[PDB]
Design a protein around this ligand. Sequence first.
Ligand code: ADP
Ligand code: ADP
Ligand code: ADP
Ligand code: ADP
Ligand code: ADP
Ligand code: ADP
Ligand code: ADP
Ligand code: ADP
Lengths: 446, 439, 434, 446
Amino acid sequence: GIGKSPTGIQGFDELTLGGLPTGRPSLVCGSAGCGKTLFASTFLINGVRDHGEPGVFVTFEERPEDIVNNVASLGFELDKLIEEEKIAIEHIAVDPSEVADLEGLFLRLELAIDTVGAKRVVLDTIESLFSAFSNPAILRAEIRRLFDWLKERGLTTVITAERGDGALTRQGLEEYVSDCVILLDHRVENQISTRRLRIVKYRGTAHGTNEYPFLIDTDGFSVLPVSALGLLHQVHEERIASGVPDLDAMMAGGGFFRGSSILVSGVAGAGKSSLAAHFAAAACARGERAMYFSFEEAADQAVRNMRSLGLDLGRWRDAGLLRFMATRPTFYSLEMHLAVILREVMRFEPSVVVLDPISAFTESGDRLEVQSMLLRIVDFLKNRGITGIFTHLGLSSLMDGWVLMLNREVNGEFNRELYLLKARGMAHSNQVREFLMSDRGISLLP
Amino acid sequence: MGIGKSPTGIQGFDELTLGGLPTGRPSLVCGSAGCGKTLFASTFLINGVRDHGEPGVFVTFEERPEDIVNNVASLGFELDKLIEEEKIAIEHILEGLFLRLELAIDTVGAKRVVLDTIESLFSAFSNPAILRAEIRRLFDWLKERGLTTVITAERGDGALTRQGLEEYVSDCVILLDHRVENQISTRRLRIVKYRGTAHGTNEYPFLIDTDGFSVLPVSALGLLHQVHEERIASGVPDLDAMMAGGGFFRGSSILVSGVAGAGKSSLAAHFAAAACARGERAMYFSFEEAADQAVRNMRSLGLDLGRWRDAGLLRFMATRPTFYSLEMHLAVILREVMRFEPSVVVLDPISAFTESGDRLEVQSMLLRIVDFLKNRGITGIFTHLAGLSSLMDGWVLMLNREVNGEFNRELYLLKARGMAHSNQVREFLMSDRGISLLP
Amino acid sequence: GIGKSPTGIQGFDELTLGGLPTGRPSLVCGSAGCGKTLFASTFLINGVRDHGEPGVFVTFEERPEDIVNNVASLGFELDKLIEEEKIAIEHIAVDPSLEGLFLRLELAIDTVGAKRVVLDTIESLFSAFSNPAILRAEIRRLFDWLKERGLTTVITAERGDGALTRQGLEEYVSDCVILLDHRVENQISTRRLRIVKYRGTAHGTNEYPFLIDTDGFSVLPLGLLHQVHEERIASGVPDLDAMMAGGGFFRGSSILVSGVAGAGKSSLAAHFAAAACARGERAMYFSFEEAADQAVRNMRSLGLDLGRWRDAGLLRFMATRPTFYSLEMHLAVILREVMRFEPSVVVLDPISAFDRLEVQSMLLRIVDFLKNRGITGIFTHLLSSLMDGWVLMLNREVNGEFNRELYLLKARGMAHSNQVREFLMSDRGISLLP
Amino acid sequence: GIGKSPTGIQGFDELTLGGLPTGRPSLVCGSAGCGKTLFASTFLINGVRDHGEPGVFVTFEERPEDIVNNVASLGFELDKLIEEEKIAIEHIAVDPSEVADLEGLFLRLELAIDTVGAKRVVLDTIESLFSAFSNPAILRAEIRRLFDWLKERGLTTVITAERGDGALTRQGLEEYVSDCVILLDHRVENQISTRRLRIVKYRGTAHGTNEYPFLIDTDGFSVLPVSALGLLHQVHEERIASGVPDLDAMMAGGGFFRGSSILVSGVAGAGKSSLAAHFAAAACARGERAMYFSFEEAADQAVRNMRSLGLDLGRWRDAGLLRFMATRPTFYSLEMHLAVILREVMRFEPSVVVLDPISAFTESGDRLEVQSMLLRIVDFLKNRGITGIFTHLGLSSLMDGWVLMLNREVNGEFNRELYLLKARGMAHSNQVREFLMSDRGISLLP
Ligand SMILES: Nc1ncnc2c1ncn2[C@@H]1O[C@H](COP(=O)(O)OP(=O)(O)O)[C@@H](O)[C@H]1O
Ligand SMILES: Nc1ncnc2c1ncn2[C@@H]1O[C@H](COP(=O)(O)OP(=O)(O)O)[C@@H](O)[C@H]1O
Ligand SMILES: Nc1ncnc2c1ncn2[C@@H]1O[C@H](COP(=O)(O)OP(=O)(O)O)[C@@H](O)[C@H]1O
Ligand SMILES: Nc1ncnc2c1ncn2[C@@H]1O[C@H](COP(=O)(O)OP(=O)(O)O)[C@@H](O)[C@H]1O
Ligand SMILES: Nc1ncnc2c1ncn2[C@@H]1O[C@H](COP(=O)(O)OP(=O)(O)O)[C@@H](O)[C@H]1O
Ligand SMILES: Nc1ncnc2c1ncn2[C@@H]1O[C@H](COP(=O)(O)OP(=O)(O)O)[C@@H](O)[C@H]1O
Ligand SMILES: Nc1ncnc2c1ncn2[C@@H]1O[C@H](COP(=O)(O)OP(=O)(O)O)[C@@H](O)[C@H]1O
Ligand SMILES: Nc1ncnc2c1ncn2[C@@H]1O[C@H](COP(=O)(O)OP(=O)(O)O)[C@@H](O)[C@H]1O
């Protein structure tokens, strides 16, 4: 096979089944601000601090001081690594030389490689040297000289590529001369930007072909890990207590399955948030830890509103079992939102997760995007064994349980009814049940 | 007096080209980066040596042989073994070019040639007429030498090739394409030109998996259905009894429509369990619930899907629609149905694809699925949460409808093609004894 | 009226109102694999075979043996014609490189006494002219030369990146321009031909789909001149027939059987076809969701034995899939089979299986052809004003049981029953009551 | 003001309020086959045969023999005019001269002008001479030399322009140097081609700015005449007899207004075609002449079908009062269809015009195109005083009268009812009326 050098970006390495190709040049293309320089920096830094592989960073415009300080904010301590002689930075600048001896660069490169003992290399803005080459055949020959140099030396090299007016690179050659080609793009849609990565080419390995949204937060380059893939869900035969005993009773077995995904759907003011809060509070009382993701209400406001029904979510927030997360759709974009959901869930290790409401994303993306991000969330939760409570104003087919709460007018008065529409794996009551809200909470009438 | 074809060993490609590539003539596999031109040419050579003994030479102008060999070693091409057996050679590099090629060919007496990165030379020619003359010189040399050549071409910022002339100088031109839509990449092959023969003019999706370069074969053409008189047992004897003759015809396509919690997955599980208990092998494609979850939920109704699975008769496949494209979904389905050769297939629910494509794409996919299963005499069950009765030989509508604050479960036998069927509506009950219709 | 030379493609000659312009050059433009070379080959070979007009194929790049073999499969049999001195192929080659070309041409044309010429891949020469003025001046010199000699010439133009040709001038210097394009839509590729310019004549200006089949370059030639007959047709359901004054529908009519699934659309269409075959008429049944054996099996349930008629050769059952080769291609296949079989009754089941405007045009054309040929057509659907008769078959829920009823919603030119008729399906078939 | 030289294309001259500008150069741009050469030919020919204005046709590639024969099919008898010395053709060809004395062309031009006494000039494929000029400033200067030459001589000149890759002309200069610029385009939509003309520029005059569909039939360049514009309708206080006396009675005054537009709408088999045929037959019996435009039925078939109801449309067809026109939507494109409708109506001078059905165009164009072409037809008819009967399966607001024919099921039987929904300018019955079809025709029950 082909050897794989890992980068340290967990999601990227997973999608590439081990990382970049070892002893070969890799191309990371994109426009300005897409993440190519930071990806190469992370490649080098993680190669040193996770695989004892020293690195050299060749820069043709960006100053070495700039290169270290532009990552100091991510705590990479590149200044540290440079003083410790695990990473070196070689700066090459030109001006009258460009009109027209690349062996000099080869010598300088080899010298830095030997000083640091480098096994990984980064070549940033090679365009500064190769934009002088006007004839395409000559440009191709020289790029081949450089890439074959690196191959011979067996250095794992990440080479930057400016997209310019082109689909991958300005001149449209390095994408064909490289063995692994990655595209980073920063696409805006309805004033919202999303970073996406794509493995366009990778000889000698399978990988993910699709576009994969990624992130450059204060924690650096980060990709959604495919590990939490779909349909590997944990199956539990134990049941969950919802906090509404009269609902829990309607099902044979005493309640919904643990790690089940249950959709509470209805009209506004029908009790969806109330039921979800009941779920979370029952879990926290049992001693589990729960997450409540509000997208329409503030955490303090939800605690208040539920106080009216007798749920003291504040007690759980203080104990540290319940964690509220309030965020509106426009802020934290759809992929951003998926990422924060999954991440904060990993950190808190909840047992029950409530999404109130999953309709808040209905108007923030086409049917496919909304449905697919919801698929990802539900798969993540069930693979972790988390009981998910999704409130809503096709999803029913995706959910393990379905509760419908209706405040309907009859004879000049609104009555609240509850339907258990779906409850896979059990017998359950077909009978509509009237339900009342009060200080005692949600109750069901005979 | 048709032309002569040399097969590539890619079943789908050879079926679409009616024999393979033009023999003794150069073809042009155009494509962007990572679309599979080099892999298609490598497969051409490897299948030539394995299936028909025709030695092969891979002439690369820029990439090195060890890199070629490692690039394909992960797919089990055993290039190194073939080079030692002197069946395949990998040589690195206009009369001089011709001599170097004759050398590379003499290494193993190659009958199949591949030209990788011919752009190294042809980018030097700036004048269009000169470039065209040289290209035609090379292509005519390859025509006369008695070798079947596959030439890779770089699309670049072009429709097929970067300079836009080799596609016109060649006689067989195939575009390899990797198009993204809704973040999903689909690999497609197209025959843009093929002089001397009929062939598939449409776009055809293909995979580059552990099986290599693979095109779905159109040998499962539509409307060649296997027609059987024998009936298939549903596992619900009252349902099968509603139909004169004992139930649905074997090899039929049967839709099970309804609202969530209506019993569609349950009826389909009854079908699969009945088949496995008869000793036939069944396949449950679940697009929404994991295999173990489905087994658990069906145990409640009293079906030991787990027993049938461990017996090897039942194959569960859990697959999220959004993970692939619709074309790739069809390809994966059909491939696994081939590998398993089941008698009963379940798709639970096909409605999970409607979201992932417009009516035309999903309808075509379901056309191909039903045509495949019926051409093989496989009874297909499709659950649904819309005019799909077009492709369905049978149709069962399961309702869980509210009356007086109570939900009654009813069954409609809407379509029973070719048989007297009860058009009455039957109330049913679900229990540990399964699905039972009340008399 | 300009002088025209037929190409031999029925549809193309009909569209161009006689064919290509005589003694003048024509420009067949297209991207790679669109059919310009085959079009030119057909021009020449049909010229020699149908009109005795010898031909010369001047190729600047492609080899003559390649030219012969790339068309041998189509039965054109060019090699015999070269031996017989009806057609010639002349290979002009160029490598790092004015009237000498004209000299060689003239020699070629005189060897075989050619009145038709093809010029394939003049780009070999015209790609070296950088100056646009120079290039078009040379193009004009060539076109003039050909017009002075009076040879009907088809010139191939490579579209390349351009909209017609790579350099964008031959389309202006030529008098007749035909753009062939192989356009993909939903992974389905359709070949279209368009007469961009044809000086001196009216002609079809739209895009016309064509097919390069194993028979070759083919275009489908329909109109609103329906053949009118009073004769009445037996439906197989004599009571339905009786509901109509005189005893049925008009022979040549177009009928729509509409309803839900399991309503009896295919049953009624099979009844029509079986009645026709029984009285001795050739009937055709185009299904787009059912195999022929499946149809005979399912109709034997109601008592129709279509196997009898199929074996007798009176019934021809054809099964296709709509999503394969595009709507106009379908139309073409259905049409060719109707032409072959000269059926009295044609069935299309379901027509709903076939975007909106395309399907509307296809259906209008099918009805037009059947009517003009005098054939009665039974269309099934899961239009009402485009047909002549309309039968609505209902399987409606009443008291938790589906009752089966029939409406005769439309029957142009006759008094029918405004009454609904409850109908029963049984081993004997379709029956009704008042 | 500016002098206007008419071309002979009635619609073009109307849209330009008199034709091209006199003594100035005009540019007719377009791709191949759009109608520029034929427009210039018509310009010259009609200038000679309608305004005693002799012409010269300068051609730079197309042979003079070709130029005459390519119009012989239109009966222009250009060979005649050339022998009679009213039009001349001057052919200029080049080849080695193009690499690099335009005064020679000026001399040749002036000589032809003086021979024929020309007042109109056409310059066809000036590109053959001016494509040699590479520098844009020099090309502009030379084009200005030529156009100023023509201006000085006061010749009304039509200059061809090849569109090429450009929006109007290949080099993008003549459109700015000309005083009148016209664009001819041949746009395909759903495999159907439509010819459109546009006055892009015309200094010194008002004109139509919109795109105007035109035609090149066997009668040559032809434009829809805007003269039959909208809302100048003829207003009649006399009434029409529909042939259904019981319908005519429901309206105060004895029937619909003459020159009225009446929409018969309903379900299939409801009697729309029958009522329309009754209208046409009543008119033809009165002695008027009527047109019946079928888009779903053949003329013989419609005569048969109506025979069943007792209308002998064959008698009227034979008398010459009734004229049938059968054509399907796809054939005779939407603009094509408008054109044939209007034209054949002008020729036949009908009194009643039936369009059966105007729904046949529902699926052949977007709502705006269908509605606007229908607007044009209705305006044309009412401006001529023609009574229009439009059958159908927003238009109601456009129609002067509205009849609704419904075959509705009740108690397992279909009954036919007739509603007079609208009838401007009169009192009319609000009562639904049952109607029966028989050999006696359409009758209404008390
Ligand atoms: N220290 C940092 N902290 C947070 N975000 C950063 C940091 N550095 C860069 N980014 C984000 O990642 C992007 C990466 O920029 P960079 O890769 O250096 O430029 P390019 O991709 O053009 O080479 C920036 O545009 C910014 O949005
Ligand atoms: N003490 C109480 N007694 C009765 N009803 C209450 C009480 N407190 C809150 N509610 C009801 O709860 C509703 C809000 O429920 P909520 O959980 O927000 O449902 P949704 O999520 O559908 O908006 C209010 O409309 C109100 O009728
Ligand atoms: N061993 C492998 N396993 C799976 N996929 C592979 C393997 N080798 C190559 N591929 C696929 O083929 C693509 C490269 O094919 P190749 O023909 O070499 O590229 P190009 O189209 O640039 O010539 C990669 O993007 C990858 O998805
Ligand atoms: N033992 C049982 N008794 C009664 N009903 C049951 C039993 N087990 C499962 N069910 C019913 O089966 C339903 C799940 O059926 P399923 O096959 O998932 O239908 P669908 O696929 O239409 O959602 C539950 O809603 C429940 O009502
Ligand atoms: N013998 C044949 N049988 C069927 N189809 C053919 C045959 N020869 C050529 N074709 C078809 O004709 C198309 C174009 O042929 P050709 O005219 O040579 O292309 P070009 O546009 O380069 O001239 C091909 O795509 C192929 O499908
Ligand atoms: N022997 C029979 N007795 C009663 N009904 C029958 C018999 N054979 C077939 N059928 C009916 O015919 C129907 C199939 O009719 P079909 O022609 O397929 O209608 P459609 O084309 O509208 O689907 C079935 O639903 C079935 O009820
Ligand atoms: N004699 C004719 N009879 C009918 N239609 C014609 C005639 N001559 C030309 N046409 C139509 O009008 C168009 C005008 O062509 P022309 O104006 O000469 O070319 P261009 O517009 O490229 O200069 C032709 O493409 C053809 O469709
Ligand atoms: N002699 C008759 N007696 C009764 N009804 C008739 C007679 N002749 C024709 N019809 C009726 O005329 C209808 C056709 O009317 P038509 O004018 O085509 O209406 P539409 O234009 O709405 O289709 C048929 O459905 C039929 O019921």
